[PDB]
Amino acid sequence: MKYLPQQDPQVFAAIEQERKRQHAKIELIASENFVSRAVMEAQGSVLTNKYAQGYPGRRYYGGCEYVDIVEELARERAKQLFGAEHANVQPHSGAQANMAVYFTVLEHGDTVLGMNLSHGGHLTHGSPVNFSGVQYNFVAYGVDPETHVIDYDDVREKARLHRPKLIVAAASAYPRIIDFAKFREIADEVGAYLMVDMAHIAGLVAAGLHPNPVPYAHFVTTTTHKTLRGPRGGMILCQEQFAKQIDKAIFPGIQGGPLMHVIAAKAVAFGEALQDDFKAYAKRVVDNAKRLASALQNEGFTLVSGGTDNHLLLVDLRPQQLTGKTAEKVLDEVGITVNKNTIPYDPESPFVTSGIRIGTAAVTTRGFGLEEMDEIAAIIGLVLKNVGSEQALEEARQRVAALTD
Template structure:
């Protein structure tokens, strides 16, 4: 007997699966798990606890869990050519917090991007950085080139002598100038932490930048954006920070670290050893194609001076037509899923003037430049109100029917990622 409440929950989840199956998902923070990684999420690991580190657990029954965690950790170290890696953070924000609390003190000076300039909320006052009570200072940003102003940043580093320079971001179109900042940072004793949450999969594929080799002390990240693993976090870098980071993660920030996610991450790391380069290459090709075609169709795609994008993201100023929120809602009615976004000319708390698009999930489904060209026309027509939503929605559903298998993983053709797995036939 299944209660009415549970029936309603299952019904809504099934409706969501149908929506995603029939939609063009362009949320830059999302991706799809491979069948083998998804298998890990429903394993018995999801029921268990393993506080501590492999071989030093507080509970018994962890011998196989230990082996999986060691394997996943070694794969992460190998993939990112790092002295140490920790797969226990359960989100990208917790990976950031592990660095903030492990290596810095309350009142230390932080330089980071503002949110309108692309900085993540965890880099600013009212989130993770604020919890550490940093003295937060803004990194100078070029609003046309959509990247850091190097000379102005170097001047500011010399002037305020920060303890931490936090690079990376939530809107992250182009590699950040780590090498150009590193020398001056060292001169004043500042550490560089690179938040690679959005671009971790591109880094794994060797197609964006290599933060450690360019001078970052630590790299934090999410494991589910361009990196197509389970939702979670990762931190890696120099071994001289390893013990402080590990102690901060446990027992400081995490008790049990979601063992089924660790297993799924290990599987994804194993798959990405073989697929990351091709996957990252096609992601960037698709993003460039989408951006260029949107621009050619009359939309104000940002970053033109630098070729629009070098990552999975495209940023569009839609203020000539409407607010970012209303444009995103209009696109959603046609089953094109994007998010409204602040752009550098906006202020926090104001109505968003832009929309942000990410192509990593569509790439995972096998879409390439030709589909990006088709999609750009539909988006432009909707934004400029040249075509009715219902007509484009029909085209979206028709296109998506041909792209419901996974690529760049093992056994991708065997499982539709949007299929609801019905374990109880009631």
């Protein structure tokens, strides 16, 4: 940076702290990642100056010829990447991507079936303090209390009883592969649309390490950050027959002018995802996640579902008589960033929890491998089994510093 250090010392200093923080800590929040310098440059471009309400070739302002190329590059790269017939790259967030789809197919008060929030479902999948649970009548399907795998007979029973107009699949904290074919089969039985929120797994889907929801869902929503390693924002994929209504739901439906500089960064992130090395990256994410799971079990930790199929895992902390809140706090003390997360059938409230959620996408981006995963699990073991020992936490602190150079 050249001009921000001189114009705004206060803001620059805080950014510089955050930059140094990101390097110092072990980042294990499952929804986080580090974007490339090229993605950031696209976000810091003069494209923020342009109003481009509407769509490429169908704008409401003149002078859009070049931001039209940028958006079309984003749409076409997304479609090549996921095999989708249509892409909308204008959603400001994953929240707005979901919102737009709900706006498309639903009327106020319609019944929607989604995943239990305490079992892995997202806030936008029907929380009563969220627009989704306020606007629409959400019902939940759950996971098996022993395997923590989605109970597909429960999905089917809840669908046949409640008769939802929409079924939502996918999660913020589900460590196994989702069967999208089974979700569609249930959707077809009850005549409901199927929406898949692939926000967490989108990078793995692109790399062919998770089954692709695109051939099974009427609508696929996602974030561009997370495993896709793009800028912060949303995207909708859908069949050609829904394209017009989905575009209209985004604008003039729920948004105005899109963020063209972020759309540029999305296109950059998609270009990176089409390359071979991102495929190799994404495999290392899954490999690392499996290795970290195995290594934590070796330490004596119980994991929700007995391991992982994707980028994330959940530690069930009850055997150690620890809450997620406690674990989160003490790991933060030694430089390991996790978040407390409800485990399925959690005896604690969502604000305390019995679990921590861990993901490998960020540390894999930094270059961490299988050896590093073993060490991370060893540090977590040392910390969580010696919560009252300050010399153990200092040892952990030093071992975290060794990993981050």
